[PDB]
Amino acid sequence: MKEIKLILTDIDGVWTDGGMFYDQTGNEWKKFNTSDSAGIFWAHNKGIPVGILTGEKTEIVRRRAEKLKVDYLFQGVVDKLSAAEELCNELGINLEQVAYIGDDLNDAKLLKRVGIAGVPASAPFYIRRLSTIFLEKRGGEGVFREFVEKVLGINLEDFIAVIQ
Amino acid sequence: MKEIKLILTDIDGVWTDGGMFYDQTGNEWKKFNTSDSAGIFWAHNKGIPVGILTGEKTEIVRRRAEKLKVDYLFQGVVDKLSAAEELCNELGINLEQVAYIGDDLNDAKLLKRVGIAGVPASAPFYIRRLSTIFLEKRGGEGVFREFVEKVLGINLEDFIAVIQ
Amino acid sequence: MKEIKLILTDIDGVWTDGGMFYDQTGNEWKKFNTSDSAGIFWAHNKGIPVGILTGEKTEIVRRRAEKLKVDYLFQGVVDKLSAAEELCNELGINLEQVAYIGDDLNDAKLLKRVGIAGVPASAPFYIRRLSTIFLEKRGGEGVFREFVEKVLGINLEDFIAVIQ
Amino acid sequence: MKEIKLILTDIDGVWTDGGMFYDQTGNEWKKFNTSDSAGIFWAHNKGIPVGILTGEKTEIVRRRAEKLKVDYLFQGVVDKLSAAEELCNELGINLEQVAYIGDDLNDAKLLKRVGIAGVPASAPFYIRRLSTIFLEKRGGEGVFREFVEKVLGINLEDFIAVIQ
Ligand SMILES: [Mg+2]
Ligand SMILES: [Mg+2]
Ligand SMILES: [Mg+2]
Ligand SMILES: [Mg+2]
């Protein structure tokens, strides 16, 4: 795989199946998958920071990013390519050293510019075709984990090393 | 696809998988799919209003229709066909210029009177067979998006034009 | 299809996929499927009452049962066969004229004794073999609707009748 | 099947599909499956205690364990192998007389040391390959029940005997 210095990810439709739960009181939910925490685990084990880029803006995602010790959190993002470029500039890397996973229209410009692009199997066809690696899983199934494990070449020997 | 001037949609079993969540206190939830918001995006991009016709009546749905800037919302509807015909009069257009998607008994009469009828793959067979185009997706899987994209013939060229 | 005078049903694993949602405060949810309402619709269309027999006892099911105008609701039932029999006596009918659908251990004695026993596809093997008709659907998938439609011989002619 | 004197279980990804529901207010949900209660029923029927070992710590799980009358609950466990050894030491039990089911990295060391290891079909491959029996079911689908019934050899004869 390409040398990756930063992993960036969308939330809805990647860390979730796109589900947006609404009640009668103005409250809102998302359903995360505990499996995706291993994505952060493996990135951090390799010395790679992870950032969230999302167009939504919620306390739900603030809490999840905190629980998982995600390095960067940008919400209400209107232009994900610009946000990514700006963070790359701050970090001293280029987009070719970024791996980004996203599933929809607001992800497309960024997906086309990154070193490794991932798109869940549940995504619209014209977004899926931008993926540069195959991902088997759908949003919310542990596809963030699947993406990280492939991008970083996590293998049986890595597994054995961590559970000793 | 015929010149459509209005897209109408049911909620439960279309925008959702029919799930109705109840707690112990009289609160209630629905689970929407973020993918469907693209259905409103594509409709608006092409100059077409979207309207919701639902037999239920909840703040859940009012909040979702607001978020998505849906043009028309009718809840607690007893007779969807007549509600459609009214709106067609209010707006000065014909049932023939309407695309409607629904999934159950209360949708049947209207489905039979519109220019393009859509029914999710998850619907009962006698409603399914009313559909005039094939929809692959189940309620809550982004089938509203699928419908709008088929109805408006959204293609790769449209995609390339909106993500520049 | 035998003559049926009473339709009875379990809740968890039939009207739901067995899901029991718990929060941090002692509240609880279940997820119903709007499709199952049509089961009550068709039963009432044929002049057949429906009763709920459940071992759990929740406000959740109280509120759902009332919304659907279910005819009998028995919760915290420990002996479902005895409860059915008592109900049969009230209506002057026998077990051979009852159709019951259930998915688990607390249902087996009753399933064995009714005129038509239905068990969702999702149920344990040793319960599924008690079913006297085949049901395709899993719990929470509209399997109560499937059951009623099969039991009452609901066909396309019935459908055309009710929308016309 | 070997002699089993204690069944131990992880929660997230075994008792659930890994789902972690967050709202806007700091509350949290898990979705259990009523099917898994039969896991406890059969263990207790055979006189075998059940213990939960989870890395998470929530009222959600405390309440669930209490309602199911689970014999031991350990939350916020950082080293499951050690927690299992200490519980076993109190009870007089060898790890070879234990059946444990788990799905992720924090379960691997203990899975490798128990008499029967179970892993849901939904788990990562490097965990699933530690399983010493085949489990068909995914987390949240009643795979804890499947595990219990397999390891205790629950068969049609037990089912016939337990319903009179
Ligand atoms: Mg997304
Ligand atoms: Mg509907
Ligand atoms: Mg049940
Ligand atoms: Mg786990």
Curated annotation (Swiss-Prot), chains A, B, C, D:
Enzyme class: hydrolase
Taxonomy, superkingdom: Bacteria
Cofactor binding note from Swiss-Prot or TrEMBL: Binds 1 magnesium ion per subunit.
Effect of residue 67 to A: Displays a 300-fold decrease of the catalytic efficiency and an unchanged affinity with 2-keto-3-deoxy-D-glycero-D-galacto-9-phosphonononic acid (KDN-9-P) as substrate, however with 2-keto-3-deoxy-D-manno-octulosonate-8-phosphate (KDO-8-P) serving as substrate the catalytic efficiency and affinity are almost unchanged
Cofactor: Mg(2+)
Entry EC no(s): 3.1.3.103
Keyword list, A-Z: Hydrolase, Magnesium, Metal-binding
Entry similarity comment: Belongs to the KdsC family.
Oligomer and partners: Homotetramer.
Function summary: Involved in the biosynthesis of 2-keto-3-deoxy-D-glycero-D-galacto-nononic acid used in cell-wall polysaccharides. Catalyzes the hydrolysis of 2-keto-3-deoxy-D-glycero-D-galacto-9-phosphonononic acid (KDN-9-P) to yield 2-keto-3-deoxy-D-glycero-D-galacto-nononic acid (KDN). Also able to hydrolyze N-acetylneuraminate-9-phosphate (Neu5NAc-9-P), 2-keto-3-deoxy-D-manno-octulosonate-8-phosphate (KDO-8-P), phosphoenolpyruvate (PEP), gluconate 6-phosphate, tyrosine phosphate ester and glucose-6-P as substrate.
Protein name: 2-keto-3-deoxy-D-glycero-D-galacto-9-phosphonononic acid phosphatase
Lineage: Bacteria, Pseudomonadati, Bacteroidota, Bacteroidia, Bacteroidales
